[PDB]
Design a protein around this motif. Structure first.
Motif, PDB file in Angstrom:
ATOM      1  N   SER A 134       0.802  -1.218   0.000  1.00 30.43           N
ATOM      2  CA  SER A 134       0.000   0.000   0.000  1.00 30.43           C
ATOM      3  C   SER A 134       0.847   1.287   0.000  1.00 30.43           C
ATOM      4  N   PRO A 135       1.134   1.846  -1.191  1.00 36.84           N
ATOM      5  CA  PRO A 135       1.940   3.043  -1.217  1.00 36.84           C
ATOM      6  C   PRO A 135       1.169   4.260  -0.732  1.00 36.84           C
ATOM      7  N   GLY A 136       1.873   5.241  -0.192  1.00 36.34           N
ATOM      8  CA  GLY A 136       1.296   6.600   0.014  1.00 36.34           C
ATOM      9  C   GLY A 136       1.503   7.471  -1.233  1.00 36.34           C
ATOM     10  N   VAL A 137       1.737   8.788  -1.070  1.00 38.42           N
ATOM     11  CA  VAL A 137       1.824   9.654  -2.234  1.00 38.42           C
ATOM     12  C   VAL A 137       3.241   9.478  -2.728  1.00 38.42           C
ATOM     13  N   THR A 138       3.340   9.042  -3.975  1.00 35.34           N
ATOM     14  CA  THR A 138       4.550   8.439  -4.526  1.00 35.34           C
ATOM     15  C   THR A 138       4.901   9.166  -5.803  1.00 35.34           C
ATOM     16  N   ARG A 139       6.182   9.503  -5.996  1.00 34.93           N
ATOM     17  CA  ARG A 139       6.646  10.357  -7.124  1.00 34.93           C
ATOM     18  C   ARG A 139       6.504   9.587  -8.419  1.00 34.93           C
ATOM     19  N   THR A 140       5.504   9.955  -9.197  1.00 30.38           N
ATOM     20  CA  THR A 140       5.178   9.290 -10.448  1.00 30.38           C
ATOM     21  C   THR A 140       4.316  10.297 -11.181  1.00 30.38           C
ATOM     22  N   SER A 141       4.317  10.247 -12.521  1.00 31.19           N
ATOM     23  CA  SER A 141       3.345  11.015 -13.340  1.00 31.19           C
ATOM     24  C   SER A 141       2.022  10.225 -13.399  1.00 31.19           C
ATOM     25  N   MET A 142       1.375  10.180 -12.231  1.00 27.70           N
ATOM     26  CA  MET A 142       0.191   9.345 -11.916  1.00 27.70           C
ATOM     27  C   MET A 142      -0.591  10.049 -10.775  1.00 27.70           C
ATOM     28  N   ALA A 143       0.088  10.329  -9.656  1.00 27.28           N
ATOM     29  CA  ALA A 143      -0.395  11.295  -8.662  1.00 27.28           C
ATOM     30  C   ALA A 143      -0.353  12.720  -9.255  1.00 27.28           C
ATOM     31  N   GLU A 144      -1.283  13.004 -10.174  1.00 28.41           N
ATOM     32  CA  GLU A 144      -1.297  14.266 -10.912  1.00 28.41           C
ATOM     33  C   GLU A 144      -2.459  15.091 -10.365  1.00 28.41           C
ATOM     34  N   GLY A 145      -2.184  16.360 -10.054  1.00 28.57           N
ATOM     35  CA  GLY A 145      -3.031  17.160  -9.178  1.00 28.57           C
ATOM     36  C   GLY A 145      -2.569  16.952  -7.748  1.00 28.57           C
ATOM     37  N   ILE A 146      -2.773  15.739  -7.218  1.00 31.63           N
ATOM     38  CA  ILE A 146      -2.537  15.442  -5.787  1.00 31.63           C
ATOM     39  C   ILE A 146      -1.073  15.334  -5.375  1.00 31.63           C
ATOM     40  N   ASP A 147      -0.742  15.938  -4.236  1.00 29.16           N
ATOM     41  CA  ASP A 147       0.599  15.900  -3.686  1.00 29.16           C
ATOM     42  C   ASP A 147       0.549  15.607  -2.162  1.00 29.16           C
ATOM     43  N   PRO A 148       1.695  15.383  -1.561  1.00 28.12           N
ATOM     44  CA  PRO A 148       1.669  14.995  -0.127  1.00 28.12           C
ATOM     45  C   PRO A 148       1.004  15.980   0.846  1.00 28.12           C
ATOM     46  N   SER A 149       1.133  17.280   0.550  1.00 27.45           N
ATOM     47  CA  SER A 149       0.581  18.397   1.359  1.00 27.45           C
ATOM     48  C   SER A 149      -0.902  18.349   1.570  1.00 27.45           C
ATOM     49  N   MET A 150      -1.656  17.785   0.648  1.00 27.78           N
ATOM     50  CA  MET A 150      -3.104  17.545   0.878  1.00 27.78           C
ATOM     51  C   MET A 150      -3.484  16.462   1.924  1.00 27.78           C
ATOM     52  N   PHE A 151      -2.499  15.781   2.522  1.00 28.75           N
ATOM     53  CA  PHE A 151      -2.736  14.728   3.553  1.00 28.75           C
ATOM     54  C   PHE A 151      -1.973  15.023   4.854  1.00 28.75           C
ATOM     55  N   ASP A 152      -2.503  14.532   5.980  1.00 30.68           N
ATOM     56  CA  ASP A 152      -1.862  14.722   7.281  1.00 30.68           C
ATOM     57  C   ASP A 152      -0.832  13.585   7.415  1.00 30.68           C
ATOM     58  N   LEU A 153       0.441  13.905   7.186  1.00 31.44           N
ATOM     59  CA  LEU A 153       1.485  12.880   7.118  1.00 31.44           C
ATOM     60  C   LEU A 153       2.499  13.129   8.206  1.00 31.44           C
ATOM     61  N   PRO A 154       2.869  12.102   8.963  1.00 27.84           N
ATOM     62  CA  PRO A 154       3.983  12.213   9.913  1.00 27.84           C
ATOM     63  C   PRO A 154       5.357  12.417   9.264  1.00 27.84           C
ATOM     64  N   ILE A 155       5.560  11.858   8.079  1.00 25.82           N
ATOM     65  CA  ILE A 155       6.771  12.019   7.310  1.00 25.82           C
ATOM     66  C   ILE A 155       6.363  12.859   6.101  1.00 25.82           C
ATOM     67  N   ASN A 156       6.896  14.074   6.002  1.00 27.98           N
ATOM     68  CA  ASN A 156       6.487  14.988   4.951  1.00 27.98           C
ATOM     69  C   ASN A 156       7.183  14.560   3.670  1.00 27.98           C
TER      70      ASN A 156
END
Lengths: 240, 240, 240, 234
Positions: C184-206
């Motif tokens: 189960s990946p989180g927000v992962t650097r790919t041209s797939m998470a387009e629009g969405i980035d890590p900042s839109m989620f409450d993450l312990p590891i930024n």
């Protein structure tokens, strides 16, 4: 430059296997538990693969909460550690009505209260140290923490407790570069698996899990950077 | 007759609200807490809706495991109860490094050790009594037991401990006609949720949860027969 | 002997990283996706590290359930595979009210329906083959399958469906020597998470998670034998 | 004043038990299902307890995604509803290797695709309607969505899919005054020896409806599952 790991219950079973793997990986391993002869015997077998890597013994009564929180008798300062594996635990099986008070209360202190105290001691000492790569705190839990069974009420409670502690710590310590996880074994070929055996549970994979399977999971975690707040379950499908 | 319910932490907040609804549903309610004056007031407030319904107080120090395990001071036999609601608890907020040992250790005792003891007394006393309808044991947990947050390390551990206890009891006591569950409140309006408030969490539904909504879940569980091993989350979506 | 791995969505991002890592372990890798040029470029980079190790491409439209189900155009029969990694998937963000029908239905097909067909074919081909070590089926899911967020309703459904499929298959196939898990990946650097980035989620590891971190969990699983019916979460603490 | 509730699969088993109880609480129940003769039989027996309460039937093929999506043939516009219970669903048991494609695809469509379409039509019509208490969207799931068993691969997937939908919707719609939950039955009379159960036996339909009713009267429950499964998931 060899990093320091602390493994409680490092002298036997799962904890020995962990310590062996972490030593093969270059970690300077401190192993902590009661039996001084056993600790020394494991320490001799710990591989030394990188120059400047040193192992250590810590004779530590895992049921003494003040000793754990004070880090009493430890060979190194709490601030030395980049890896802490809480493998410390006792198992007991009994219907709850018949579970002797001295026993379940001792189990709770070994499995939960003492590791809380140890963990506080570690986090206080390493929180503000500069890092670049996260430190790791990893607790050994059990399938029973997540899927209930008869006759393990307090055992289950103590380690579900550990799971809840992990999840909150993960959120708290993430911004400080400390990653916090559990590894959850099924029925593993050890003592405290004296009495219980795999054929007592409905397992998709039948039989015993070897201790090195649990260590593979710990090693995987230690090498990772983006895993926190999770359980890695090595249980032959018990929790499926 | 009218069935007996025991409710710990019953003298204010959620436990008061749970005792009021249970009284309203015809239960003879025993309420236990340290503060006899606050207990007597609650008792005077409890509805009496049928004949031979009688309520009671039990001055019980929630941090005395021995007292709890022996039913010390109880006004009725442990064997009388058909419902036990383990509502007793303390919440404390602190970075884990800064959490005073006396504080977190008392909290674990109040939140987990004492309830285990008290649960053991009840289960011992009722496991063999005959029933055509299940008896109920219901623990009050918290959203923080399942979804981690900063500064609630030990609090989370204690209540996730209760969750683990619950699942395993549910398995053990099922074939005995005892159903075991948790109700998990979010941020509820009690002098208990002190300083910490709904704005401090990411919540689908903003604002406070009134104590009556927690009691609604308990009442739902008390009247059910096919619900065991579960949590009813009344948390405004905190765990979503 | 070189074992065969099938990796769908194998041509870029996470799928490419998994294929690279499995090839570096000595697996003969078949990478399957729509885009042939991208496929061939990845194949050309796959390490060849032992004798008898060969790699292949399979041009497959991952929206075509019938083609997936029949291994239409595949370079090897389903019976060849000891590892199947289902990485095939599309993500889409939209309030549900505004989520265009064609889009969300196509997402459902790519993320759930077509992998179910593909899995059916692998399982039917390999179930009665004899095995000393277990075969692996590994699905790539998402933190969003387990913790809810706005504007990802149908995406979360599709991947939660995968999780649900995984646990049941794990129970079904464990006695056949096939281990089934999710990564189960989180927000992962790919041209797939387009629009969405890590900042839109409450993450312990930024921050972004790198594709290699997801591959490492895949490789862990593939080398293991006692893990089934689980998720390995690599999500910077999203699910904590 | 009586609110509108929509209950799909409202003519038999759990749906009927839900329609009955909601009717007993004051709701005007619209029940949607394929079997028009059974729809009328149940509409005929639904309690009337509130001034202005009126019940409705909707002949709906629960596999027709487009009809679900467009409220085709419905007696009331989607905008009328304050409660939607998605009870709609098929279960099938087979080794995955021998599971006929027309069967499992149709189950997926009934259990997941069509309920998404219906949910969309409801959420679109009600999101901006002013509210004093929240609207409710409740899916009926299954213990098998959370705890695996053999021979129920696709069924489990379809219902875990519903669970994942429910959790995101709950976060998306909470600010709009819509609470979204699942009730997860165990083996309910409509076999229990298949499963390891702390409580032996069948669950009666009314125990499932009890959960739905509790949900419906609540204000602060969203993003959750209420499990009535005799301890299956313990």
């Amino acid at each position: 430059p060899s990093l320091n790991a602390l493994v409680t219950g490092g002298s036997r079973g799962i904890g020995e296997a962990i310590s062996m793997q972490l030593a093969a990986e270059g970690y300077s391993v401190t192993i902590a538990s009661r039996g001084l002869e056993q600790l020394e015997a494991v320490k001799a077998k710990l591989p030394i693969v990188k120059q400047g890597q040193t192992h250590h013994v810590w004779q530590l009564d895992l049921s003494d909460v003040e000793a754990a929180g004070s880090f009493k008798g430890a060979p190194l300062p709490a601030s030395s550690y980049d890896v802490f594996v809480s493998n410390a635990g006792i198992s007991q099986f009994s219907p709850i009505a018949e579970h002797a008070d001295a026993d379940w209360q001792n189990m709770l202190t070994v499995n939960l209260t003492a590791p809380i105290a140890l963990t506080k001691a570690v986090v206080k000492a390493i929180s503000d140290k500069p890092r670049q790569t996260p430190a790791h705190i990893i607790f050994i839990s059990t399938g029973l923490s997540k899927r209930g069974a008869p006759m393990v009420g307090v055992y289950s409670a103590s380690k579900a407790g550990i799971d809840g502690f992990m999840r909150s710590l993960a959120r708290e310590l993430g911004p400080k570069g400390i990653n916090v996880n559990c590894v959850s074994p099924g029925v593993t070929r050890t003592s405290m698996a004296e009495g219980i055996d795999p054929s007592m549970f409905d397992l998709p994979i039948n039989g015993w899990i070897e201790v090195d399977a649990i260590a593979d999971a710990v090693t995987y975690l230690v090498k990772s950077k983006n895993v926190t707040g999770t359980t890695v379950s090595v249980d032959n499908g018990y929790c499926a």
